[PDB]
């Protein structure tokens with residue numbers, strides 16, 4: 001037992017990290033097969049970032065201008081291209097450590113692990129959720145750009161995120177591995193509105209089931225509710241509306257604990273209306289939303 | 305910016321995990337050089353766990369009874385020995401993936417990453433603190449025994465913990481890599497008292513400095529205190545007494561933020577006496593104690 005914000009083992013991703021330098025800018029790249037993926041802003045200078053003309057900036061660059069180092073070995077760049085906000089540098093050597101992988105575009109509310117990297121070297125790993133407003137609340141300093149988010153299904157790494165920037169509010173924005181930003185963000189040093197965020201209701205419910213599985217049951221009550229009544233409370237407290245698809249995904253957890261999803265919704269309703277009353281749930285004094293129902297099942301069963 | 309409960313990249317440890325089977329019991333082992341380290345309770349049966357006579361149980365075992373598999377390859381066991389609560393199985397092959405490593409016995413209040421493993425395969429990674437009462441609040445199911453805790457200094461992995469058991473209270477107990485339990489715990493299915501735990505004061509203070517560095521400053525006040533006055537509040541709220549060694553270790557963070565350690569102690573004093581008043585600090589509604597001053601500096605600087 002016990003419930004922790006667990007990240008995937010980062011080994012398969014560590015083996016893909018490289019350092020990419022262009023002129024005087026250095027960030028992280030992801031070396032998979034014979035391609036190195038990195039944020040296209042690696043081609044900018046400090047004066048370029050207000051509104052870079054990336055097509056023009058990339059034209060002044062040749063394959064030899066992109067310095068790619070994997071640890072101590074230098075990769076030979078034989079091709080370069082921009083796809084959306086990422087640069088794809090073709091190298092003459094396939095990464096011997098390339099795991100089985102996929103590029104996926106995650107949905108808001110889904111989770112993933114981030115391997116924070118600086119100068120091509122891994123510093124740490126943490127579990128993130130893609131917020132409903134398409135930002136992530138990460139830990140990223142200067143040089144962390146090009147660090148990636150991923151999930152691992154047995155031996156397959158599904159890369160879902162690449163870090164590009166920090167908004168003036170301290171939240172993080174980035175792209176999928178095809179270079180498309182999540183949310184309305186653009187890769188320029190401009191003030192950008194992150195949309196109104198909401199709490200991931202299905203995840204808070206999944207976490208309440210994890211709490212019941214692990215012994216924390218104080219919040220369980222003698223009440224039930226309906227999807228419509230619960231959604232009136234969710235709207236008031238800036239929670240995502242709960243749908244039947246969300247109820248269906250909570251099926252396994254409802255089955256294991258024997259607590260109907262709507263009864264758990266009534267517990268959540270009372271927690272939203274009354275607060276925690278100085279108590280904790282799974283060591284937290286607030287309602288956690290960065291564990292999906294899948295994460296809860298995986299952690300509570302022992303999937304490797 | 306941003307502050308997260310970050311674990312070390314687990315790659316160097318993943319490469320050491322093996323599955324150890326003895327009779328019908330299977331748990332995880334750590335393969336370093338030509339030695340596989342695992343909890344000695346791998347030699348027990350269900351009827352043995354009330355009070356195992358490990359010396360007698362190990363005598364009925366031969367090298368061929370210890371089945372060690374690293375992924376799909378079978379290791380050949382050429383020696384076996386018990387050192388405290390760990391078994392050391394000498395194998396005929398040095399692990400090609402053995403990183404630079406040390407065995408260290410961590411101090412209470414210090415942190416480390418745990419690579420939870422099942423059947424020799426890594427499931428996830430999380431950051432833990434060794435509680436002042438020598439337990440850890442982990443996430444460990446049946447089969448997780450033999451999973452290890454570690455820190456990484458550049459290329460050197462300092463292994464500090466091996467998981468052995470879950471106390472009836474849901475907290476976790478284990479040993480250093482020489483097989484000595486942290487705390488008064490013994491490897492038997494007996495009800496065992498975990499000592500009175502306390503909050504790691506120096507870590508909560510280190511985390512308050514991380515909050516100030518990252519923008520959360522609401523808790524800063526116009527007050528100061530003394531070590532003696534603060535310690536009267538710490539005693540009341542079951543916080544570890546703050547010493548000059550702790551003040552000294554907070555030196556760098558005090559220097560960076562320009563907030564004297566005793567002024568931060570007065571902020572902590574007011575937070576202890578008044579609570580959070582429905583507010584949060586670094587996304588938490590309680591006082592976090594599982595980040596050391598070293599962890600804060602590392603995360604806030606970008607050490608890889």
Ligand SMILES: *CC(=O)N1CCN(Cc2cccc(Cl)c2)[C@@H](CC(C)C)C1
Nearest residue numbers: 041141142143144145164165187188189
């Ligand atoms: C991710 C990272 O380390 N950095 C944040 C982005 N910086 C450039 C930038 C500025 C404004 C908007 C965007 Cl999309 C990108 C990085 C600059 C260094 C020199 C790599 C730092």
Ligand SMILES: *CC(=O)N1CCN(Cc2cccc(Cl)c2)[C@@H](CC(C)C)C1
Nearest residue numbers: 345445446447448449468469491492493
């Ligand atoms: C760590 C783990 O997976 N397990 C917890 C300990 N179990 C045996 C046990 C019982 C009582 C006290 C101690 Cl020190 C150890 C493990 C049993 C399986 C069969 C490995 C499970």
